[PDB]
Amino acid sequence: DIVLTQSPASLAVSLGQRATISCRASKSVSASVYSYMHWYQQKPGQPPKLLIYLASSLESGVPARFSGSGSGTDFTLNIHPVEEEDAATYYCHHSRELPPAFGGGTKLEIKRADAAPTVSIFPPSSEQLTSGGASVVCFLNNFYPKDINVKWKIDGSERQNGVLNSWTDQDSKDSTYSMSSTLTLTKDEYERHNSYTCEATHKTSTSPIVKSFNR
Amino acid sequence: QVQLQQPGAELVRPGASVKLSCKASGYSFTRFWMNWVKQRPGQGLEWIGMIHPSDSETRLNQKFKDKATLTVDKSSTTAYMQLSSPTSEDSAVYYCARKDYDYDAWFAYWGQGTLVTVSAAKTTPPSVYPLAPGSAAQTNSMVTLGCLVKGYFPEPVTVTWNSGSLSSGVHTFPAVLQSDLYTLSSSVTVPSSTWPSETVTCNVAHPASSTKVDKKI
């Protein structure tokens, strides 16, 4: 069949610039000068949405900044000027032959200035302590780039076990990143220590950002 | 308004079978062909099969051949896809779309989606807990709060603040699987003047278990 190889697998373009994404087919999709290609846009938690069909034709209702070009086995998706809301996963489709298949996908990211995380730490809840468990959560919001590291320090000593970290996707409007860190401990483990510290290592601060509380 | 409706999620045991429904409205059901797409997180999109609702003529992928069975109900304007013996690799979100044929065939509409989780575990409703700072130095004009949702299987789960009253400064973190149960948290940032007067509530809803949980911070 016709296999599609998209390159690169992830792209980062600054606002106001042009974003190029290539979709290469193993065999020619061109038929009577009209090539079979479709460019889809899918945001997290939603189905894809059509942008350009017939590779040359922008769908009605889609902004004019979306466009496409190429013929035969070569096609591209050009977004100029890129906007903060344009961050999503792009796909390319081919109806030429059967069975139909979709490309590997290209995740577009916006390039902007760095931002420092806002650290907030919430001690375990009184309701959870009643059940015998203890969970201390540490929220990090609005930091760019996504590369960051969090460290838990109990009474000045680090604990790497029992930590669950989760990173979000790029916020459409804010184009920032957010993460949270959950350190789970029992009731006895929580009552036998007092100081609980959450620290963040980000490229915008020479030293970790210290946020803590006392039991 | 053309729309394709699907169930929220479905839980199935290994070796069993499932029946998924795709309901179309606002347009002639038999006048279009129903297609199915598979999306596994991180894998991307994968094509399943197409069917002609009028004559029930089917075309299936060599990969999904004999794994899936397509059928339609013209009285209810609903399309059905039966999957036999799902495995750990068959867990993914399934979509149904109306493929519009003009020259090249694209998808002008997509279904709501259905998450199919293949596991032997039993539905566990979530246990919500409030998260309050309880202290501060008066170094910020904003007040950050959080909500912990843990001990629930399978995904997904809805999390809102005051029944969606606060759409700003809200961050829903993806769930992490630990001990067969998923755990996520969410945070909201409200002005320091709003928090004393206004109450902040964590509204959590689990579609599978059909349970709603409200916890005040």
Author numbering:
A (entry chain F): 1 to 215
B (entry chain E): 1 to 217
Give the published text.
The ectodomain of the S protein consists of a receptor-binding subunit termed S1 and a membrane-fusion subunit termed S2. By using a combination of biochemical, virological, and cryo-EM structural analyses, we identify three types of cross-variant neutralizing MAbs, represented by S5D2, S5G2, and S3H3, respectively, and further define their epitopes.
Thus, the RBD-1 of S-S3H3-F3 appears in a transition state between “open” and “closed”. This S3H3 Fab engagement-induced conformational change may lock the fusion machinery in the more prefusion state, hindering the shedding of S1 and the subsequent transformation towards the postfusion state. Our structures showed that the S3H3 Fab is bound on the subdomain1 (SD1) region of S trimer. Our structural analysis showed that S3H3 binding tightens the B.1.351 S trimer with its RBD-1 in a transition state between “open” and “closed” configuration, inferring that S3H3 may inhibit viral entry by locking the fusion machinery in the prefusion state and/or by affecting RBM exposure to cellular ACE2 receptor. S3H3 does not block ACE2 binding to S trimer. Mutations occurring in the SARS-CoV-2 B.1.1.7, B.1.351, B.1.617.1, and B.1.617.2 variant S proteins relative to the WT S are not present in the S3H3-SD1 interaction interface. Thus, these mutations will not affect S3H3 binding, explaining the observed broad-spectrum SARS-CoV-2 neutralization potency of S3H3 Mab.
